[PDB]
Coordinates of C-alpha atoms and ligand atoms in Angstrom, one line a residue:
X1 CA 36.3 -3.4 64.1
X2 CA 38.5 -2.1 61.0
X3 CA 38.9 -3.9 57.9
X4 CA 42.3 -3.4 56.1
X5 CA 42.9 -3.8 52.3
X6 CA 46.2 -3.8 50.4
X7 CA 46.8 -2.7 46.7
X8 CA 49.3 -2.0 44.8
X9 CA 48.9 -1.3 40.8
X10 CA 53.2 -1.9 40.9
X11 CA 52.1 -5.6 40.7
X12 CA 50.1 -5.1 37.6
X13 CA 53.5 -4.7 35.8
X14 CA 54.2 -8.5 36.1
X15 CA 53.5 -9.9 32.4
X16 CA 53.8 -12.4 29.7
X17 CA 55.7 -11.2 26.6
X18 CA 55.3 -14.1 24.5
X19 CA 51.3 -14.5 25.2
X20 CA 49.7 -11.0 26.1
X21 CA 46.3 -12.8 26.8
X22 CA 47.4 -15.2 29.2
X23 CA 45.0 -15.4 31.8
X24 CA 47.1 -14.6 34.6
X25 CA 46.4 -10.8 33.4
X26 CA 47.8 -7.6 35.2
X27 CA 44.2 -6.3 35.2
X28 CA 43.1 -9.3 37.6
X29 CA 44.0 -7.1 41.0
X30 CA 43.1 -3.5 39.1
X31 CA 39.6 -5.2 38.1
X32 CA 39.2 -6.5 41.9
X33 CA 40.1 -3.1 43.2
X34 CA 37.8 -1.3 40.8
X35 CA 34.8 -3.3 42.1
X36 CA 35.5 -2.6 45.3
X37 CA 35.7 1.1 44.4
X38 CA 32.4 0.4 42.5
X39 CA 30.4 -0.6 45.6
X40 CA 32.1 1.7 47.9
X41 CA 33.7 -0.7 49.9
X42 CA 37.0 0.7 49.6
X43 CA 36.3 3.3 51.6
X44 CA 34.3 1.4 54.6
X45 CA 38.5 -0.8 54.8
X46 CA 42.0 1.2 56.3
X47 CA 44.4 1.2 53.4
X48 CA 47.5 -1.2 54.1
X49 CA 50.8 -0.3 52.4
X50 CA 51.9 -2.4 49.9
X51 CA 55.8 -3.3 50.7
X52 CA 58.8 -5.4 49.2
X53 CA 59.7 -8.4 50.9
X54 CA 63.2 -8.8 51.9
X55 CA 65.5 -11.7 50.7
X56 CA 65.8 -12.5 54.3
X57 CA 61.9 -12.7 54.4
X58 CA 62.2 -15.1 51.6
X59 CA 64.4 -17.4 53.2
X60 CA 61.4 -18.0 55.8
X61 CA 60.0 -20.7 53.1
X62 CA 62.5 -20.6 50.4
X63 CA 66.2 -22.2 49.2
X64 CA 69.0 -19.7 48.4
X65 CA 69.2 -21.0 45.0
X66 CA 66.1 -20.3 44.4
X67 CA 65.7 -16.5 45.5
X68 CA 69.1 -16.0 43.8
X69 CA 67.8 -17.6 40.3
X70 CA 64.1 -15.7 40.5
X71 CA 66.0 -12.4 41.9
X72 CA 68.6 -12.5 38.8
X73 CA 65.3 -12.3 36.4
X74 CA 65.2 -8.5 36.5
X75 CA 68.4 -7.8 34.7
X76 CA 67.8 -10.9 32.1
X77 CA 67.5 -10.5 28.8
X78 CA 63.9 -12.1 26.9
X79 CA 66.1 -14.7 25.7
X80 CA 67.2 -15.6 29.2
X81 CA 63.3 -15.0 30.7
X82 CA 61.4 -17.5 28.1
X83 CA 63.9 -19.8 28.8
X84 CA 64.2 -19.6 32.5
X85 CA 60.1 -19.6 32.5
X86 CA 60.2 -23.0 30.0
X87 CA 62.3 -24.6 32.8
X88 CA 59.4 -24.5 35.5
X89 CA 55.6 -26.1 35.4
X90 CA 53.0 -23.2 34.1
X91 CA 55.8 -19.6 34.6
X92 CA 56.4 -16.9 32.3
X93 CA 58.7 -14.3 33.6
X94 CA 59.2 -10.6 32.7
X95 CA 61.9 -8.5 34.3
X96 CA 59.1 -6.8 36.9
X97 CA 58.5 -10.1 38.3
X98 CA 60.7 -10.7 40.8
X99 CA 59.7 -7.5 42.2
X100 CA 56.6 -7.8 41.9
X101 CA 56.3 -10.9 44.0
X102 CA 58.1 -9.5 46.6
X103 CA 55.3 -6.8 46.6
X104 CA 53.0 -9.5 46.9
X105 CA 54.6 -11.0 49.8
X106 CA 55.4 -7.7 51.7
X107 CA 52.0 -6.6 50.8
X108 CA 50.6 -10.0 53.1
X109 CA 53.3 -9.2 55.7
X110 CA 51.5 -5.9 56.3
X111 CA 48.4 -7.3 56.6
X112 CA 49.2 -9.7 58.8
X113 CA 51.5 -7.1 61.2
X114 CA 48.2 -4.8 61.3
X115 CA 46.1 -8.0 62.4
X116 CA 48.4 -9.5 64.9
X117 CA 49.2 -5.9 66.3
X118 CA 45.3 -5.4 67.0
X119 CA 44.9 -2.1 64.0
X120 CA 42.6 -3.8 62.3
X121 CA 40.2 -7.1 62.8
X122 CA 40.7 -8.7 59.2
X123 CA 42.3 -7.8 56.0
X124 CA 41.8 -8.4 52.1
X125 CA 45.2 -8.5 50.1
X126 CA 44.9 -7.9 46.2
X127 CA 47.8 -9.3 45.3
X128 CA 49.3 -10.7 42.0
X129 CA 51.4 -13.2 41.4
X130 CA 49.9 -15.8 43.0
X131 CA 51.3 -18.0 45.5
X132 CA 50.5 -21.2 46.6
X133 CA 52.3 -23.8 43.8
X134 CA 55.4 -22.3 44.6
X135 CA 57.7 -24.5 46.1
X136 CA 60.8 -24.3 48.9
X137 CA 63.1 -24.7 45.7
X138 CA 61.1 -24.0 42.4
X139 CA 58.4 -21.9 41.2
X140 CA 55.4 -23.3 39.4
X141 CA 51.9 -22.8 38.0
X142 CA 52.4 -18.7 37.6
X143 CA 53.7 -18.5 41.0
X144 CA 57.1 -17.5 42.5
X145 CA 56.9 -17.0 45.8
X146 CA 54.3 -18.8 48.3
X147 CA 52.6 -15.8 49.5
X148 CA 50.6 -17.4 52.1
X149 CA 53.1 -19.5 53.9
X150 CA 55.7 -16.9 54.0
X151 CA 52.8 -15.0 56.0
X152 CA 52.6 -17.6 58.2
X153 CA 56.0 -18.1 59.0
X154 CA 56.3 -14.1 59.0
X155 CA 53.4 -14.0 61.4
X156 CA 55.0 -16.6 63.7
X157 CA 58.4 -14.0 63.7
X158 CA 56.7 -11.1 64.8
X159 CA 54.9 -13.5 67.8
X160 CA 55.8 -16.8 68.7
X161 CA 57.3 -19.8 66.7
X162 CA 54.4 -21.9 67.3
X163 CA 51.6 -19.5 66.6
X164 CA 48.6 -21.8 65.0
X165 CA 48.1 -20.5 61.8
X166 CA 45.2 -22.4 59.4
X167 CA 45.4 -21.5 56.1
X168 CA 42.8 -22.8 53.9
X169 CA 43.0 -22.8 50.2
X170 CA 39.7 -22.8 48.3
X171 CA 41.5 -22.0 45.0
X172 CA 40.7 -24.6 42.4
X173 CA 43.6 -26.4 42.4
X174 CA 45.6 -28.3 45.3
X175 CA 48.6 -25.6 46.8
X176 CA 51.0 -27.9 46.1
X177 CA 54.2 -25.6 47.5
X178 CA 51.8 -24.9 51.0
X179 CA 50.9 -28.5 51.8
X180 CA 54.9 -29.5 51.5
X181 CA 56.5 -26.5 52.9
X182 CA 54.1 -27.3 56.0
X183 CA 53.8 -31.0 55.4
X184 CA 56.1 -31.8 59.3
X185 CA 54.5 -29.1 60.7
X186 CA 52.0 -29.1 63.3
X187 CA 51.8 -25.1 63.9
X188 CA 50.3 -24.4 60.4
X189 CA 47.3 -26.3 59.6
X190 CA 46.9 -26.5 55.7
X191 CA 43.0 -27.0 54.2
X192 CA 42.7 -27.7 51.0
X193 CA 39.5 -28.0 48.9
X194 CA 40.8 -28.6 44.8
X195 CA 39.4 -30.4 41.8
X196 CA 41.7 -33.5 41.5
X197 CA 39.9 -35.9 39.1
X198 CA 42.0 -38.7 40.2
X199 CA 45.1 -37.0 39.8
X200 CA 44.3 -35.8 35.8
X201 CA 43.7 -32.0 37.5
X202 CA 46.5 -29.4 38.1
X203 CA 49.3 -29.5 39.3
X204 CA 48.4 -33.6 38.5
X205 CA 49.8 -35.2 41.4
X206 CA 48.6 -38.0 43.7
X207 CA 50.0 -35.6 46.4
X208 CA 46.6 -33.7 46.2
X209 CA 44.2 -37.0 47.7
X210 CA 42.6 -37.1 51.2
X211 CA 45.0 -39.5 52.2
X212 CA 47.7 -37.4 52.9
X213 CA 47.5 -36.6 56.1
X214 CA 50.9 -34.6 57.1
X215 CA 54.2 -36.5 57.8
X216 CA 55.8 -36.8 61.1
X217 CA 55.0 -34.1 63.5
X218 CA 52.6 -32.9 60.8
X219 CA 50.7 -36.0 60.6
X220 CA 46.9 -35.0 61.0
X221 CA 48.0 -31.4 59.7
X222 CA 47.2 -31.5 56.3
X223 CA 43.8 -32.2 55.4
X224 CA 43.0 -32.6 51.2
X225 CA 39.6 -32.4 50.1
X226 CA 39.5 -33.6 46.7
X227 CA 36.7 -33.5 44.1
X228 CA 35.6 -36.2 41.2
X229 CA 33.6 -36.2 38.5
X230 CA 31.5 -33.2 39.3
X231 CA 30.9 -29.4 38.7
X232 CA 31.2 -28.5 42.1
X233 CA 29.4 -25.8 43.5
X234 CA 27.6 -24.1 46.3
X235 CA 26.3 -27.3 47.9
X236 CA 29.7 -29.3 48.0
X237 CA 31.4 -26.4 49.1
X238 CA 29.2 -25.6 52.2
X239 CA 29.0 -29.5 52.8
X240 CA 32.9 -29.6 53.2
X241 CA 32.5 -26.3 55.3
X242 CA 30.4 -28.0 57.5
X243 CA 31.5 -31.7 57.9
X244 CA 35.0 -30.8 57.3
X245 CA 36.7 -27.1 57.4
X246 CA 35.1 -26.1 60.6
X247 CA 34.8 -28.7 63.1
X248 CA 38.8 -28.9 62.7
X249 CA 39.5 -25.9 62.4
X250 CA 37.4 -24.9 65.5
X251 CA 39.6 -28.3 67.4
X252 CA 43.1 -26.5 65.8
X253 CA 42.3 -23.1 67.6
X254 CA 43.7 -21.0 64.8
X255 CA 45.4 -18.2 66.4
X256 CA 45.8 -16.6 62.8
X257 CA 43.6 -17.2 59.7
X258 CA 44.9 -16.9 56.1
X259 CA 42.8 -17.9 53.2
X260 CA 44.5 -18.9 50.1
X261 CA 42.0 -17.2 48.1
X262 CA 41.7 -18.1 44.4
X263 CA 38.8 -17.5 42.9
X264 CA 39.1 -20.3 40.0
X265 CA 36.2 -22.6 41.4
X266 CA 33.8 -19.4 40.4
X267 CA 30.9 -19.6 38.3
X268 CA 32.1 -18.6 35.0
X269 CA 36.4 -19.3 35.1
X270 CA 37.8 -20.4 32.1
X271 CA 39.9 -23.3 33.6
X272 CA 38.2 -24.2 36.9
X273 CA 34.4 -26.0 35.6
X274 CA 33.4 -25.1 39.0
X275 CA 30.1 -23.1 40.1
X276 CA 30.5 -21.5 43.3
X277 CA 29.0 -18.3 43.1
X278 CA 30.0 -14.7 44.9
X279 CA 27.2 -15.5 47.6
X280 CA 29.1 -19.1 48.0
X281 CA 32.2 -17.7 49.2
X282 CA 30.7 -15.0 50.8
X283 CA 29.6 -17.6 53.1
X284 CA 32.8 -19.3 53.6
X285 CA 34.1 -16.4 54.1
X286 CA 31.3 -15.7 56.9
X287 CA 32.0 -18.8 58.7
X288 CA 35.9 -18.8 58.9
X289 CA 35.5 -15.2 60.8
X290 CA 34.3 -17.3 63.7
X291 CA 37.9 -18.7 64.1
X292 CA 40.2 -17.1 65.6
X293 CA 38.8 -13.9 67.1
X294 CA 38.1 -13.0 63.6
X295 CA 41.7 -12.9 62.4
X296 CA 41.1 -13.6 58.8
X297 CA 43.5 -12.3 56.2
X298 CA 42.4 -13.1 52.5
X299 CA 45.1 -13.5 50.0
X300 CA 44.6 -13.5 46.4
X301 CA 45.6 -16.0 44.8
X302 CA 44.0 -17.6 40.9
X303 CA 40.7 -16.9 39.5
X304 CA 40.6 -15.9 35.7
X305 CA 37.3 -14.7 34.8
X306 CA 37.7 -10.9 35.3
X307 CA 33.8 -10.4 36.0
X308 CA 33.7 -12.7 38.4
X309 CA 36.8 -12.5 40.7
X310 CA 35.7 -9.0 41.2
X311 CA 32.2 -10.0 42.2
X312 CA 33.4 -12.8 44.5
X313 CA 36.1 -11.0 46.4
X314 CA 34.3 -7.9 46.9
X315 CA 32.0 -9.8 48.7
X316 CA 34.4 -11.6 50.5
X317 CA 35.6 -8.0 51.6
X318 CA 31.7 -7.5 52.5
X319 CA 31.7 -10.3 55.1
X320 CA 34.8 -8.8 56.5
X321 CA 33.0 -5.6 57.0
X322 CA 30.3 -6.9 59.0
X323 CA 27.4 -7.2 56.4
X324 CA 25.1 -9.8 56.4
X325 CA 25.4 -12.9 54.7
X326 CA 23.5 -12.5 51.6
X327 CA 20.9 -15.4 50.7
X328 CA 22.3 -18.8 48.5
X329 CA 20.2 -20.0 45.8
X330 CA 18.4 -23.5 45.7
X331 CA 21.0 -26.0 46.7
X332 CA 20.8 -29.4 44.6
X333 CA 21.1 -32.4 46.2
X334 CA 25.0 -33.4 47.2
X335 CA 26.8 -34.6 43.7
X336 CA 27.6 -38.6 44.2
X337 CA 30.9 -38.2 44.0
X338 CA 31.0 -35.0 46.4
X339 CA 29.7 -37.1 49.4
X340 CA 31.6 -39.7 48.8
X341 CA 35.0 -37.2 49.0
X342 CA 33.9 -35.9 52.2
X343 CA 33.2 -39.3 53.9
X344 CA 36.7 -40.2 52.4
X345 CA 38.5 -37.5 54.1
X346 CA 36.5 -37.8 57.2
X347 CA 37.7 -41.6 57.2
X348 CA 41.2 -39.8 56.7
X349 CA 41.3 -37.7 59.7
X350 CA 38.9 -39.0 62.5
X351 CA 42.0 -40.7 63.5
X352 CA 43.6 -37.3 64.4
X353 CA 40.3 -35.0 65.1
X354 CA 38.1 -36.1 67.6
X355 CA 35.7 -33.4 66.3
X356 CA 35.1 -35.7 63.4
X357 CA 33.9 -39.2 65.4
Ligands
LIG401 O1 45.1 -21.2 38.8 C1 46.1 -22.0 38.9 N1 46.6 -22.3 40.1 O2 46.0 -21.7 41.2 C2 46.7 -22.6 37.6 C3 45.9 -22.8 36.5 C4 46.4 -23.4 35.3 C5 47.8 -23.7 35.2 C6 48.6 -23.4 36.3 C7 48.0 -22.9 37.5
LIG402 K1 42.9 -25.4 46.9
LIG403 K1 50.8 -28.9 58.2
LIG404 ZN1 44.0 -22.0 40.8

């Protein structure tokens, strides 16, 4: 079995003019890269080519206006970028951004063409900017494009229309742009763990709680796991995992898995409070290559301590590579609050998983 990896250092050139220390740095993807260098893993994967994603790609997930507006950015002058950025949630814009989220995008399209077409089992993509807040219509929360579900829909062009595609997000925060874009859908099953805190977490919308459940043909589709008052780590994450991420996803029969993969909830993030640690996801990792034949692609997506997304997605890579899970440390008793999000979402969706009664 062959594990791919894309990277491009093109998508370093993304930046913030105003703020050169914003956290969503270009050195985020070359620090990931490096550690995989570092530990020699780049050498066990197949290199993927990074590629631009075509407007027609785009339109997959996205509104006309809103390719044409974010397209436009190149040729703008700063004037036009700061305020074009100040008219979104959480965006700065330079005039390498729009091509560097195509290069984002393509980059996942290749990924997911060399998985599907059976050259390689599983695939990391490091991959800046992120993704998953980006809406049909808007862009939001440092991201443009939503990486993630234009794989899936690009994955479901290059096979069949209803291909089952999970994608689970176990970045911080709630992918606001992937649970609507998919919200009618029952061919993409959307999993979200996210710190919500009642709402007061971003992207601060009620949208984010276990009770929404997918509308229409979607209903059942869209599973929220939501934490409150608690510094998640390990332990809450593997409960989820257990009572939660992988009964339904083993019921779904993912064809195609794509992990929206920030790595904000680490131990040591400047935003997230979180303490998942490298060995943490290197066992959710682990446990969604069960699904699906293995067909796991993992997307980059936030994560803002430097040290620590490299640690944590290298050994992501790991799992994909075949090595043994390594060992957790002492798990503490289940936070309060944690249980009580799990049995809240489990009251949410044994109506539409029988997995779950
Ligand atoms: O990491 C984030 N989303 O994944 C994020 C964090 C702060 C503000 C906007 C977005
Ligand atoms: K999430
Ligand atoms: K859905
Ligand atoms: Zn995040």
């Amino acid at each position: 079995p062959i594990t791919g990896l894309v990277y491009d250092q093109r998508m370093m050139l993304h930046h913030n003019m105003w703020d050169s220390h914003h956290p969503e740095l270009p050195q985020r993807i070359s620090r990931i890269f490096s550690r995989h260098e570092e530990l020699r893993l780049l050498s066990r994967c197949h290199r993927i080519p990074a590629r631009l994603a075509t407007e027609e790609e785009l339109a997959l997930c996205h509104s006309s206006k809103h390719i044409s507006i974010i397209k436009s950015s190149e040729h703008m002058k700063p004037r036009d970028l700061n305020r074009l950025g100040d008219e979104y949630n959480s965006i700065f814009i330079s005039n390498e951004s729009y091509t560097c989220a195509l290069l984002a995008a393509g980059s996942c399209f290749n990924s997911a063409q060399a998985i599907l077409t059976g050259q390689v089992r599983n695939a990391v993509a490091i991959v800046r900017p992120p993704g998953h807040h980006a809406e049909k219509d808007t862009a939001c929360g440092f991201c443009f494009f939503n990486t993630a579900a234009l794989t899936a829909r690009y994955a479901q062009s290059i096979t069949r229309e209803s291909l089952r595609v999970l994608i689970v997000d176990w970045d911080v925060h709630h992918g606001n742009g992937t649970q609507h874009i998919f919200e009618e859908d029952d061919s993409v099953l959307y999993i979200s763990l996210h710190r919500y805190e009642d709402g007061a977490f971003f992207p601060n919308s009620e949208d984010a709680n276990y009770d929404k459940v997918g509308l229409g043909k979607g209903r059942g589709y869209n599973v929220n796991i939501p934490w409150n008052g608690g510094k998640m780590g390990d332990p809450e994450y593997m409960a989820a995992f257990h009572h939660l991420v992988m009964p339904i996803a083993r019921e779904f029969a993912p064809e195609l898995v794509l992990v929206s993969a920030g790595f904000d909830a680490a131990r040591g993030d400047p935003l997230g409070g979180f303490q998942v640690t490298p060995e943490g996801y290197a066992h959710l990792t682990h446990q969604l290559m069960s699904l699906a034949a293995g067909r796991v692609l993992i997307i980059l997506e936030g994560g803002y301590n430097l040290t620590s997304i490299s640690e944590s997605m290298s050994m992501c890579t790991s799992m994909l590579l075949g090595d043994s899970p390594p060992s957790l440390d002492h798990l503490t008793p289940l936070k309060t609050s944690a249980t009580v999000s799990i049995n809240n979402v489990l009251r949410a969706h044994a109506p539409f998983w029988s997995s779950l009664r």
